[PDB]
Design an enzyme around this catalytic site. Sequence first.
Site, PDB file in Angstrom:
ATOM      1  N   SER A  75       4.982 -10.138  10.198  1.00 29.02           N
ATOM      2  CA  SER A  75       3.921 -10.404  11.156  1.00 29.02           C
ATOM      3  C   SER A  75       3.136 -11.621  10.694  1.00 29.02           C
ATOM      4  CB  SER A  75       2.992  -9.194  11.315  1.00 29.02           C
ATOM      5  OG  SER A  75       2.146  -9.047  10.190  1.00 29.02           O
TER       6      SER A  75
ATOM      7  N   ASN B 101       2.342  -7.660  21.977  1.00 29.36           N
ATOM      8  CA  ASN B 101       2.249  -6.271  22.415  1.00 29.36           C
ATOM      9  C   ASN B 101       1.581  -6.103  23.777  1.00 29.36           C
ATOM     10  OD1 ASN B 101      -0.449  -6.740  21.897  1.00 29.36           O
ATOM     11  ND2 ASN B 101      -0.601  -5.312  20.174  1.00 29.36           N
TER      12      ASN B 101
ATOM     13  N   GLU C 114      26.414 -19.316  15.907  1.00 33.96           N
ATOM     14  CA  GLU C 114      26.349 -19.918  17.235  1.00 33.96           C
ATOM     15  C   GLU C 114      24.927 -19.914  17.783  1.00 33.96           C
ATOM     16  OE1 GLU C 114      28.433 -17.941  15.979  1.00 33.96           O
ATOM     17  OE2 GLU C 114      30.364 -18.960  16.145  1.00 33.96           O
TER      18      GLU C 114
ATOM     19  N   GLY D 230      -1.712  -8.326   6.991  1.00 39.92           N
ATOM     20  CA  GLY D 230      -2.570  -7.939   5.892  1.00 39.92           C
ATOM     21  C   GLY D 230      -1.791  -7.995   4.599  1.00 39.92           C
ATOM     22  N   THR D 231      -0.523  -7.583   4.655  1.00 38.30           N
ATOM     23  CA  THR D 231       0.399  -7.828   3.553  1.00 38.30           C
ATOM     24  C   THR D 231       1.646  -8.576   3.998  1.00 38.30           C
ATOM     25  OG1 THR D 231       1.656  -5.765   3.769  1.00 38.30           O
ATOM     26  CG2 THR D 231      -0.407  -5.689   2.528  1.00 38.30           C
TER      27      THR D 231
ATOM     28  N   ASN E 293       8.098   0.703  19.176  1.00 35.93           N
ATOM     29  CA  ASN E 293       9.115   0.549  18.142  1.00 35.93           C
ATOM     30  C   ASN E 293      10.512   0.794  18.697  1.00 35.93           C
ATOM     31  OD1 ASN E 293       7.341  -0.077  15.946  1.00 35.93           O
ATOM     32  ND2 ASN E 293       6.765   2.089  15.848  1.00 35.93           N
TER      33      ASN E 293
ATOM     34  N   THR F 112      -7.743  -8.364  16.070  1.00 37.88           N
ATOM     35  CA  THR F 112      -8.189  -7.288  15.195  1.00 37.88           C
ATOM     36  C   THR F 112      -8.921  -7.804  13.966  1.00 37.88           C
ATOM     37  OG1 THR F 112      -6.123  -7.217  13.931  1.00 37.88           O
ATOM     38  CG2 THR F 112      -6.230  -5.922  15.959  1.00 37.88           C
TER      39      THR F 112
ATOM     40  N   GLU G 243       0.842  -1.188   0.000  1.00 39.88           N
ATOM     41  CA  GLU G 243       0.000   0.000   0.000  1.00 39.88           C
ATOM     42  C   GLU G 243       0.879   1.239   0.000  1.00 39.88           C
ATOM     43  OE1 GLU G 243      -0.090  -2.457   2.216  1.00 39.88           O
ATOM     44  OE2 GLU G 243      -2.144  -3.063   2.700  1.00 39.88           O
TER      45      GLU G 243
HETATM   46  N1  GTP Z   1       4.616  -5.232  13.582  1.00 39.63           N
HETATM   47  C1  GTP Z   1       3.682  -4.333  13.863  1.00 39.63           C
HETATM   48  N2  GTP Z   1       2.367  -4.733  13.975  1.00 39.63           N
HETATM   49  C2  GTP Z   1       1.402  -3.829  14.252  1.00 39.63           C
HETATM   50  C3  GTP Z   1       1.719  -2.488  14.426  1.00 39.63           C
HETATM   51  N3  GTP Z   1       0.560  -1.832  14.706  1.00 39.63           N
HETATM   52  C4  GTP Z   1      -0.458  -2.732  14.689  1.00 39.63           C
HETATM   53  N4  GTP Z   1       0.048  -3.976  14.404  1.00 39.63           N
HETATM   54  C5  GTP Z   1      -0.678  -5.263  14.289  1.00 39.63           C
HETATM   55  O1  GTP Z   1      -0.026  -6.080  13.328  1.00 39.63           O
HETATM   56  C6  GTP Z   1      -0.914  -6.519  12.310  1.00 39.63           C
HETATM   57  C7  GTP Z   1      -0.256  -6.338  10.945  1.00 39.63           C
HETATM   58  O2  GTP Z   1      -0.849  -7.123   9.934  1.00 39.63           O
HETATM   59  P1  GTP Z   1      -1.531  -6.397   8.666  1.00 39.63           P
HETATM   60  O3  GTP Z   1      -2.525  -5.391   9.190  1.00 39.63           O
HETATM   61  O4  GTP Z   1      -2.198  -7.399   7.756  1.00 39.63           O
HETATM   62  O5  GTP Z   1      -0.343  -5.619   7.902  1.00 39.63           O
HETATM   63  P2  GTP Z   1      -0.089  -5.701   6.307  1.00 39.63           P
HETATM   64  O6  GTP Z   1      -0.087  -7.120   5.786  1.00 39.63           O
HETATM   65  O7  GTP Z   1       1.227  -5.053   5.977  1.00 39.63           O
HETATM   66  O8  GTP Z   1      -1.278  -4.890   5.578  1.00 39.63           O
HETATM   67  P3  GTP Z   1      -2.336  -3.938   6.332  1.00 39.63           P
HETATM   68  O9  GTP Z   1      -3.518  -4.764   6.778  1.00 39.63           O
HETATM   69  O10 GTP Z   1      -2.827  -2.881   5.376  1.00 39.63           O
HETATM   70  O11 GTP Z   1      -1.671  -3.274   7.514  1.00 39.63           O
HETATM   71  C8  GTP Z   1      -2.174  -5.680  12.429  1.00 39.63           C
HETATM   72  O12 GTP Z   1      -3.321  -6.493  12.328  1.00 39.63           O
HETATM   73  C9  GTP Z   1      -2.099  -5.040  13.799  1.00 39.63           C
HETATM   74  O13 GTP Z   1      -3.010  -5.673  14.665  1.00 39.63           O
HETATM   75  C10 GTP Z   1       3.052  -2.076  14.316  1.00 39.63           C
HETATM   76  O14 GTP Z   1       3.387  -0.898  14.465  1.00 39.63           O
HETATM   77  N5  GTP Z   1       4.027  -3.009  14.032  1.00 39.63           N
END
Ligand code: GTP
Lengths: 427, 200, 438, 438, 62
Positions: free
Chosen positions: C140, C206, C254, C144-145, C228, C179, C71
């Site tokens: 993650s 978290n 190691e 979502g992506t 972060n 979520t 995105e």
């Molecule tokens: N690693 C990380 N995770 C977060 C953060 N804030 C919220 N999250 C959680 O981590 C998950 C990330 O997965 P996605 O939402 O699918 O991220 P994505 O695949 O890049 O695409 P989007 O859905 O548009 O964000 C979210 O569902 C949040 O619940 C953050 O700052 N860092």
Amino acid sequence: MREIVHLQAGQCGNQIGAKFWEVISDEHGIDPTGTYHGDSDLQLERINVYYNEATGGKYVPRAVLVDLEPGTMDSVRSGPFGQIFRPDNFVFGQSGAGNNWAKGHYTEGAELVDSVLDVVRKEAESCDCLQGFQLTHSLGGGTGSGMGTLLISKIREEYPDRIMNTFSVVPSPKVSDTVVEPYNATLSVHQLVENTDETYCIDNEALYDICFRTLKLTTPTYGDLNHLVSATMSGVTTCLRFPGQLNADLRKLAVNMVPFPRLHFFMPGFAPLTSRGSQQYRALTVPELTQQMFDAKNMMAACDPRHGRYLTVAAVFRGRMSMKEVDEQMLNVQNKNSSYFVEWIPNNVKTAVCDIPPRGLKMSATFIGNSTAIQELFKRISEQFTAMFRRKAFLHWYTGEGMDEMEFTEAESNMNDLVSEYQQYQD
Amino acid sequence: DSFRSCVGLKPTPHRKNFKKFMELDSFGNISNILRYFGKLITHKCADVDRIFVIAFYLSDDTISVFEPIENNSGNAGGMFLKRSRVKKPGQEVFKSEFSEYIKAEELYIGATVNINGYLFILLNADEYTLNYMENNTDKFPYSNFELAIQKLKQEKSKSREITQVFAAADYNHTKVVPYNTFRDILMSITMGKLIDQELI
Amino acid sequence: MRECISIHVGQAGVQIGNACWELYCLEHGIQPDGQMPSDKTIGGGDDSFNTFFSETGAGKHVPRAVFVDLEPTVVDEVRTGTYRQLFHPEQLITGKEDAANNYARGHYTIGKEIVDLVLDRIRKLADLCTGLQGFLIFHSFGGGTGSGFASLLMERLSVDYGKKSKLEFAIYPAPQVSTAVVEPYNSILTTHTTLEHSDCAFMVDNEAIYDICRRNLDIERPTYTNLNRLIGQIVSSITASLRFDGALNVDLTEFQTNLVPYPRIHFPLATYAPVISAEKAYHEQLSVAEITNACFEPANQMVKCDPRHGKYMACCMLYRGDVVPKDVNAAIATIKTKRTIQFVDWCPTGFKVGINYQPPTVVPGGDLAKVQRAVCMLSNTTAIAEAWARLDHKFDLMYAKRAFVHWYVGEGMEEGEFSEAREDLAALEKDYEEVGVD
Amino acid sequence: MRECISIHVGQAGVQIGNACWELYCLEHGIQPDGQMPSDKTIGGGDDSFNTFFSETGAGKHVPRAVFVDLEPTVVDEVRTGTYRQLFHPEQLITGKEDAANNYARGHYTIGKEIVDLVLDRIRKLADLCTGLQGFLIFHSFGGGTGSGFASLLMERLSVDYGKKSKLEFAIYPAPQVSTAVVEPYNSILTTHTTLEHSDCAFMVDNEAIYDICRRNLDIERPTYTNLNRLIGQIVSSITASLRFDGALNVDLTEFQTNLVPYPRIHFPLATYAPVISAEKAYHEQLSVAEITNACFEPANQMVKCDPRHGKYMACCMLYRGDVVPKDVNAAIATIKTKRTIQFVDWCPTGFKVGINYQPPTVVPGGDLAKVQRAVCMLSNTTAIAEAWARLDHKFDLMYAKRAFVHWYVGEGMEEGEFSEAREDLAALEKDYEEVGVD
Amino acid sequence: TQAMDDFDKNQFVFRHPVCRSQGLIPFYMGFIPSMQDNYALTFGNSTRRAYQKELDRRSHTL
Ligand SMILES: Nc1nc2c(ncn2[C@@H]2O[C@H](COP(=O)(O)OP(=O)(O)OP(=O)(O)O)[C@@H](O)[C@H]2O)c(=O)[nH]1
Ligand SMILES: Nc1nc2c(ncn2[C@@H]2O[C@H](COP(=O)(O)OP(=O)(O)OP(=O)(O)O)[C@@H](O)[C@H]2O)c(=O)[nH]1
Ligand SMILES: Nc1nc2c(ncn2[C@@H]2O[C@H](COP(=O)(O)OP(=O)(O)OP(=O)(O)O)[C@@H](O)[C@H]2O)c(=O)[nH]1
């Protein structure tokens, strides 16, 4: 003439040789620039035993440094005496060991053994006639054991007429950090017993205790621990470099020291260890020297021979003593505990006196021992190996490296034979 | 490179900084290589006709020496050095320290120099370099005319002595004076201490 | 030499990467422009940055990381930030369409024409590198992506390059907070695909990070900047071995060899002990003993697991700062004398120590403490099974009533893959107890 | 000494023309008037310009070239441009009538009464020249006026003077873009006529030039200003060996002897590796290794040919700037060890290296980057026959129905000349496959 | 610290005295004015050629 070329292996030896070499330079009085400051004719007389000479009066050490990790030697080279160490003999590899025995014994060694052998033979042709070689490394060191086992094997057929001195530190019995640590030691000792002629055994826990006992300084540096072991290893070398009536050849010593071929493990011993006020609270006398010399607290190597008995004992005295005090003390120690010896050998002591003291103290001494106190050592390593070979934990790596469980079978079996041998000769 | 090997056990590829090359670079119609003009010195002068085009590359310090061919003579020349950064003529052959190279603190107007061998003499320049000279006087305090004003305002005793002699050269008060007399009448009052650069 | 490449997939995994590099540029004194002061540290890219940044002859530090996203909004926003001039432009790999939280959409629909592009990036990163010990993959599980996109690329970087390490880092799904209810769908999809190629997968949650904030850091109301920065400190601690040195130095090789017991399971747990406020650090004192106790205090772990419900296999403490071997070895010796900490009988020893002289620095506008002696505690225990045990009963109910499968069968899957992962998970749990049973 | 004359045929070849000296006068610092400042580089015409310009005792740099044209508009507007005072008036050979895209109209109707006039220029420039290594022919195969007029002059200059090199440069027809459907007619006419006389013909295609612009130069919407500057650099790189020196100097004679394997085929491919935007070069680095991979990257070439579909015979790299043989000879050694690159087994060596110390310079108000190390890649591969393979099936159908022949047979041609070409072309592919057979 | 300043920020104030140069980086999305209408310069320069004239003719940028 008869000389010695040193080998510095493993990243523990990386601290060892540097500390080992600097003491010698301070002992002989060479400045950090390498230009000796001639004050003692005898040290100028007996520097050719270990050092070669370059132009401008800079004694090049006859030692070889080997490693794989550049960062360690960069600190070593940037050390106060790295300039006294050659860019020539800095041999290493472009690989990380993973602290893995098999990689350093089959994978990484292959492309480096050629270089190191080509190196050492170059300085081998540089000198005339060696007594032998000495190696600073660890039995439980990933690179030191991996490199050492390969190299000592190759050196055996190369020069089967020399001295294969091995200086290896035993890991802490209680704690090993490395979890594959019992594997690596068992692998190494399988070849070590076949190839070596002598082995020093060293442990840090006793060194930690010695800090509590006599150093009394709570938080020391690991380098000061190297200072201790370098002092121990230097004492046996003082015999060769110094005049005064004591027979210096390790073969002069080893034949008196080794009754049967498979006896390679020997323990160090040192003389006055002095604390805060005891420097001005000590009557430095051969009796109290002999007293402190034979102390289970003065013991530092593995564990208390109180659990066992004594096979062969040899102590070297450094300073201005005479034949009688050493004679009567040996009579004194003989009568105090006669039964604690083995009835196999009476009068099993070997004494050598060096009339040239160190710089800083007059009365000094070193001891080398072969007692019945090593049973607990390999008995200890037996249980972990059996329990960890019971369920072959941490094994997919070494099989991936190409090794099989069979090599483990004889390695422990050979050790089991040693358990009986050490048991049978005494009990 | 001798000092690159004198860095650590592992080598390193030192180079020249792009920074100094960026600003000091003949870009577009703008040039940077200065061009001075002088003669040679020997026991006797034969081919001093060739006004040497010494080309100090301000980005590389590489003095190229070029020659304009003169009518009906044995010059048949041109370039003398292939834009080579040249060693100081004050060095040794056994070397122990970083040896030095000709900087930009000597090519004052009317200079005596040596490019590794033949002694060469400078007489004049081009306007463009002198325009550059007058711009940044940080490395060129000779171009600072106000500095020269202090040296000559030091002397006050020769005031009338000045007034009459340079009055003597003039005879009709025409309100000009030729350079040849003007440069000569100044060299004495400085007792041969003036350098050609400030006189220009 | 000693270098690696960091990969940040998923718009949630990108803001974490930025903070890490913002933290990373701090200890090296990196100005946002891309150059040092007049001090001479530039070269052919050879100094403390050589393991992290590429400050080549052009003089500008080039981070050796790739930012991949689907995105354009957030990745554009960071491209409008403060350190964007540092960043290589098309290392910020953006995308015009999302996966809509779908694993397969991020795996099949769009990944095919994007992987080739990032394949060009990695090879032209691979060639310039010298040792390139491994990779730093930030992602993650419920991406979502992040989820789907990482899955295929991790497959392709595995098949071409199976000789080096791959370090995995994903936010663990909140056990009781979701979520999205499709989050389990892609999460188990990630696990079953990653089990046979991933090298070291590290997780974090978290809520307990939040729980830490208002316990000792005293943060009732946190922000991602806090999250972060603290996780950025975590990777900074583990990477400090590469940057600085110590009494002994350890490497990721190691960590792989000594942490994972057996194949499949490669999922240890990190923990950082000196997580305290500045004022608390102000009028109190830090030593190895209490931080050793604190690091093993169960409430200080960020994963909702009770160690007394499981048993320990491996441990790793990375002491960064002014420490001595004496107090540490005696302190851990007392820990071995502890009766509550139930290590498995298989390992007499299960700890790896990392000593680094350099003390962790503070960050301007920060909220952490002023730490002189720090430690990151990496450990693996059998007390982690309840997580997937929580996951499976969540999955089996929803899978039985096969909710929102019309979304997935709508764009080109079948139930077989969803079937396979379940017994794969069932395989994982039974292995956990089989090794759990002595 | 070292000089050559340049001929620019066709109003296509004219805007690429003035761009050359607009570039050329720059690195020489030539003012648009025709004279330097009070500094001295003038004389009997013997300095850097002697190879390019004619700055005699009058002191005006006279370019050694001829502009031939058939439409007064474009040639007059440049005669009213910025450097028109530099240009000799009647070497802007103009014309009052067009060839109407017809090869033969320019070849028969008007060329006869114009070729004599240009020949008068040719011999008069030949007499003043001393070394006169070869010719520079900027033309175009799809020449509305470039096609016919270039051929006849090439025929005439070949017969009288066949003892020197002739360097031809024409825009290659676009594989899929057709500004005129009569282009295939005159294109094969040019090819069959030129094979038996031309020494070295060098082609290029604008679509890939367009493709580079929005890949790395970040030009989403260019103009000839950018296009001509790119190709103007190309000829500048190849001519730098004559202008400056380096570690070694090479000449067009070596280019002829070493590049072309066998007669007929003399059609190599040119490429420039450090095509990049300024900011990219600003915060990234250039070294031999990456540019060597980039120069062999298949999408770097300006001809729509896949190197994996053919095999290489010859290559040429011209290192303009600061390079040393060590990393050069090492990098090229790695290139030959590569397996994807498929040279023909006949040549163990098929490369020619040129080293020039002078770094390439930028143009004020320009688009290129600030380059220190550059390279021109003159290479020949068997994968070019596809273009002629594309042309023949394009040509055979349109000839099967004989489109617009009444235009040509109307003004004085027949089919035999067209007929001879198809088997001459059919010879070219069969020759290309026979040389493609080992 | 900041929230307590609110007391002095409001209480007696509330009471009254009873009165870049180098543009941006390529492949940037998000429409700033102009752009594609003008062309023929690199994305970096296109941003910075604009950057100076975005202050000149498309001045509706604040
Ligand atoms: N690693 C990380 N995770 C977060 C953060 N804030 C919220 N999250 C959680 O981590 C998950 C990330 O997965 P996605 O939402 O699918 O991220 P994505 O695949 O890049 O695409 P989007 O859905 O548009 O964000 C979210 O569902 C949040 O619940 C953050 O700052 N860092
Ligand atoms: N140099 C050094 N070594 C130490 C120190 N403390 C413990 N050691 C141990 O000494 C052992 C021998 O060093 P090496 O043989 O060079 O080790 P290696 O082969 O590189 O692989 P590892 O044993 O895993 O380190 C190491 O295994 C360390 O565990 C110390 O303070 N300095
Ligand atoms: N060389 C060159 N070609 C261009 C330029 N602009 C467009 N072209 C292409 O080059 C070809 C020009 O060939 P012609 O049209 O036959 O040129 P000409 O024979 O000199 O006479 P005209 O038809 O009037 O232009 C066209 O098909 C265009 O596709 C340019 O600036 N230079």
